[PDB]
Scaffold this active site. Structure first.
Site, short mmCIF file in Angstrom:
data_model
loop_
_atom_site.label_atom_id
_atom_site.label_comp_id
_atom_site.label_asym_id
_atom_site.label_seq_id
_atom_site.Cartn_x
_atom_site.Cartn_y
_atom_site.Cartn_z
N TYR A 74 0.83 -1.22 0.00
CA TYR A 74 0.00 0.00 0.00
C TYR A 74 0.86 1.26 0.00
O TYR A 74 0.46 2.25 -0.60
CB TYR A 74 -1.02 0.00 1.13
CG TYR A 74 -2.24 -0.86 0.86
CD1 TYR A 74 -3.26 -0.43 0.00
CD2 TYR A 74 -2.37 -2.11 1.45
CE1 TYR A 74 -4.37 -1.19 -0.25
CE2 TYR A 74 -3.48 -2.89 1.20
CZ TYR A 74 -4.48 -2.42 0.35
OH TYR A 74 -5.57 -3.24 0.11
N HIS A 130 -14.99 1.79 -1.96
CA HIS A 130 -13.92 0.93 -1.47
C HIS A 130 -12.91 1.69 -0.65
O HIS A 130 -11.79 1.19 -0.42
CB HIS A 130 -13.29 0.20 -2.65
CG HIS A 130 -14.22 -0.78 -3.29
ND1 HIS A 130 -14.12 -1.16 -4.61
CD2 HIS A 130 -15.27 -1.46 -2.78
CE1 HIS A 130 -15.07 -2.03 -4.88
NE2 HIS A 130 -15.79 -2.23 -3.79
N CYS A 184 -3.76 4.68 23.02
CA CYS A 184 -4.16 3.54 22.18
C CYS A 184 -2.94 2.88 21.57
O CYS A 184 -2.85 1.67 21.63
CB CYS A 184 -5.09 4.00 21.06
SG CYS A 184 -5.56 2.71 19.93
ZN ZN Z 1 -6.26 3.86 17.99
#
Ligand code: ZN
Length: 274
Positions: A74, A130, A184
């Site tokens: 990618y 997409h 996170c």
């Molecule tokens: Zn995250």
């Protein structure tokens, strides 16, 4: 007598009559629309990246198995896309949309492409069904952000090269693109739909409705192999609505449409949208 064909009409005049009186045009698009911008498709040379077909790597198991390889893939595509620019087929769609909006006629673009070249063209009413090569999604928390950074992370700088016996970069998972939310720090995946994943429920719901309201449908530069997109123009034609394919070749869907205009769409589309 005529010998039987399953090649629809090429009569531009008859199509332009439908175009003159159409209020809700739905234009469906695939990689063919960007072919003339210098962006490769899934059929020709750009169907292959190293030892894999492009569809092999755009898969949940591929990412699961080798997140670094998939990110290389990618990253290559992001970098190739970077330079490229809207061709006259993209811009004619944007111009058509601009013009017809002033007369209260709607032109909707429903694109399989993830290159954002319709957005860069000036098109405004666009469903990217997409997703986008230039958005990330977090594997832990789910944040979708745009991301146009070259390079998305320093570890990918200069990597992702396409040649089949190219040395794997084997980037450790913690040095791949990470969620910028501290507390996170999850692994990012590109925000694209992969083979075997559902499309976004709200986008698709909205696209179904746009297809139900359309009184003319254009299908430009798509192979009509990947479902569900492949069956969109078929379903419109099932309602008696005229459909016109703009493609270099026939597809197994051409049979179901009223018109078909062979050729490079950068040439065939602008005279049809005037
Ligand atoms: Zn995250």
């Amino acid at each position: 007598p005529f010998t039987k064909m399953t090649r629809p009409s090429s009569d531009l005049t008859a199509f332009r009559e439908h175009f003159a009186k159409a209020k809700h045009i739905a234009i469906i698009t695939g990689a063919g629309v960007s072919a003339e911008s210098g962006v490769p498709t899934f059929r020709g040379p750009g169907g292959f990246w190293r030892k894999w077909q492009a569809q092999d790597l755009a898969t949940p198991e591929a990412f699961s198995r080798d997140p670094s390889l998939v990110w290389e893939f990618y990253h290559y595509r992001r970098e190739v896309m970077r330079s490229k620019m809207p061709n006259p087929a993209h811009l004619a769609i944007a111009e058509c949309e601009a013009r017809l909006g002033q007369q209260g006629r709607s032109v909707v673009i429903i694109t399989q492409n993830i290159d954002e070249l319709h957005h860069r063209a000036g098109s405004k009413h666009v469903y990217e069904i997409h997703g986008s090569l230039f958005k990330t999604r977090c594997m832990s928390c789910g944040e979708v952000k745009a991301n146009h950074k070259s390079p998305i992370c320093p570890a990918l700088d200069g990597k992702g090269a396409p040649d089949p016996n190219t040395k794997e970069a084997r980037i450790p998972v913690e040095l791949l693109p990470r969620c910028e939310r501290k507390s996170c720090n999850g692994l990012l995946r590109p925000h694209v739909v992969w083979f075997g994943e559902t499309l976004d429920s709200d986008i698709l719901t909205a696209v179904e409705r746009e297809l139900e309201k359309c009184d003319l449908c254009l299908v430009v530069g798509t192979s009509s192999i990947v479902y569900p997109a492949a069956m969109f123009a078929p379903q419109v034609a099932s309602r008696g609505v005229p459909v016109a394919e703009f493609n270099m070749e026939c597809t197994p869907a051409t049979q179901r449409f009223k018109y078909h205009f062979e050729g490079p769409c950068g040439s065939t589309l602008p005279p049809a949208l005037e």
